Write the structure tokens for this entry.
Amino acid sequence: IIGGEFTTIENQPWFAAIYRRHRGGSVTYVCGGSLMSPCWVISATHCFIDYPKKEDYIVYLGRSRLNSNTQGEMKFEVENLILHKDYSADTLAHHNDIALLKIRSKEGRCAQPSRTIQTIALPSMYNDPQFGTSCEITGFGKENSTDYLYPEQLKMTVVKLISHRECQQPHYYGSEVTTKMLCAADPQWKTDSCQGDSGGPLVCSLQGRMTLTGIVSWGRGCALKDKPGVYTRVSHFLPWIRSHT
Ligand SMILES: Nc1nc2cc(O)ccc2[nH]1
């Protein structure tokens, strides 16, 4: 993340760090995601679609830093990884970018909702906070685009929400965000998401409740005058999310 602050997990008690295991050479960070209910995490197919053998991922909850074992984490396999039956990578733009992972400790069970391990609620149907709401993102994403290492502490930032007519400024993303893709960014240029963040959460405040408003997906550069980060628009997906759940 190219924005504000370094945080710790208990301000993010739903974050999901997902790792690939390798043939021999060990384990590299895939993406974030978010804890749904002790059996489930939510993220984006673009992360896994090239490499779909559920058995190579190792996701974590309660982990606070890329390569250090933080206080009281729990480790996970992924009993099933479910990718959207319809996904597509158009130039820059991603489509129906959503995915589910059923975790399972080495023991067969979903996770124990600790202090450092909460669910976050899904949105309700046709109710997304309005342009100009500040929401927040978490990930271990590049700090600077020019960087080729992801940061070693976790990062969080907050980011204002854009309206589809504004984000379809042809000076922005044209007809390529669409009704199910949600733009947001800090009034231009300075904080934003980036690489290896997608699958992270966009968590807006609705009535009182932190609510999984959107899932990070794409954006042309990180922190660019006229280039919003776009985030999947979660309420358009609550059917699929229950009928593959
Ligand atoms: N603005 C923005 N650029 C991004 C690039 C990514 O690979 C993932 C999220 C992003 N958000």
User: Anything to note?
Assistant: Residues 1-12+120-235 form a domain with the Thrombin, subunit H fold (CATH 2.40.10.10). The longest helix spans residues 238-243. DSSP finds two helices and 16 strands in the chain. The longest strand covers residues 74-83.
